[PDB]
Design a protein around this ligand. Structure first.
Ligand code: MG
Ligand code: MG
Length: 224
């Protein structure tokens, strides 16, 4: 049972290689998750210099196995069930009136550590749009991630809309379409329709000179 791997505090590593409109960059993250409380705490560093996109646009790419699934919903937790072999998470993020990100990640244990390894590719972004023009506020709204099964692929799909606040009071929509597929051959849990209720707080480390993001996140399964 992968769920048994999450009863306590688990170290997390995140590594992302990105290319947006030919701007190349990498991000490294470290922290821990405590699924019992649906809680994530991570610090992300742009190891290549200045991040060429706003940090908030990377939040959904940068480990939903740390969601809190209520006891009565535990037979719907696909993410922990795929562990430790892990799962592939792929997404298309469409920024309304702008470019798109396509991502591919593997989330699995490396020893006792939960690792999220990501490749991100962004194209067709506007030079002085909200993303490349860095016009997005350093904050983050609360969302519901709607999950449905894809029995065909032995996995799940997610559909949701991220709303990014813009510095002028407007909103930049990011439509998300994602698929998750197990890496191993063992049985996984295919859930009834439900959603993950997420809340995210972004901050800075006062002693840190590199381009970075400190994130505190709470995720709870619901709708069943
Ligand atoms: Mg490193
Ligand atoms: Mg505002």
């Amino acid at each position: 049972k992968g769920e048994e791997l999450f009863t306590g505090v688990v170290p997390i590593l995140v590594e992302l290689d990105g290319d947006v409109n030919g701007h190349k960059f990498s991000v490294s993250g470290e922290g821990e998750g405590d699924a019992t409380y649906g809680k994530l705490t991570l610090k992300f560093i742009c190891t290549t210099g200045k991040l060429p996109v706003p940090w908030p646009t990377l939040v959904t790419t940068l480990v939903q196995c740390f969601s809190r699934y209520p006891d009565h919903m535990k037979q719907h937790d696909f993410f922990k069930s795929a562990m430790p072999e892990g799962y592939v998470q792929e997404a298309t993020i469409s920024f309304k009136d702008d470019g798109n990100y396509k991502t591919r990640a593997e989330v699995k244990f490396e020893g006792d550590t939960l690792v999220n390894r990501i490749e991100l590719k962004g194209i067709d972004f506007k030079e002085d749009g909200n993303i490349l023009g860095h016009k997005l506020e350093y904050n983050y709204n609360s969302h519901n991630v709607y999950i449905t099964a894809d029995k065909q692929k032995n996995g799940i799909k997610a559909n949701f809309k991220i709303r990014h606040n813009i510095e002028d009071g407007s909103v930049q929509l990011a439509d998300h379409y994602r698929q998750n597929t197990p890496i191993g051959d063992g049985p996984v849990l295919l859930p009834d329709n439900h959603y993950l209720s997420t809340q995210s707080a972004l901050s800075k480390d006062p002693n840190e000179k590199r381009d970075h993001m400190v994130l505190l996140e709470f995720v709870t399964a619901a709708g069943i």
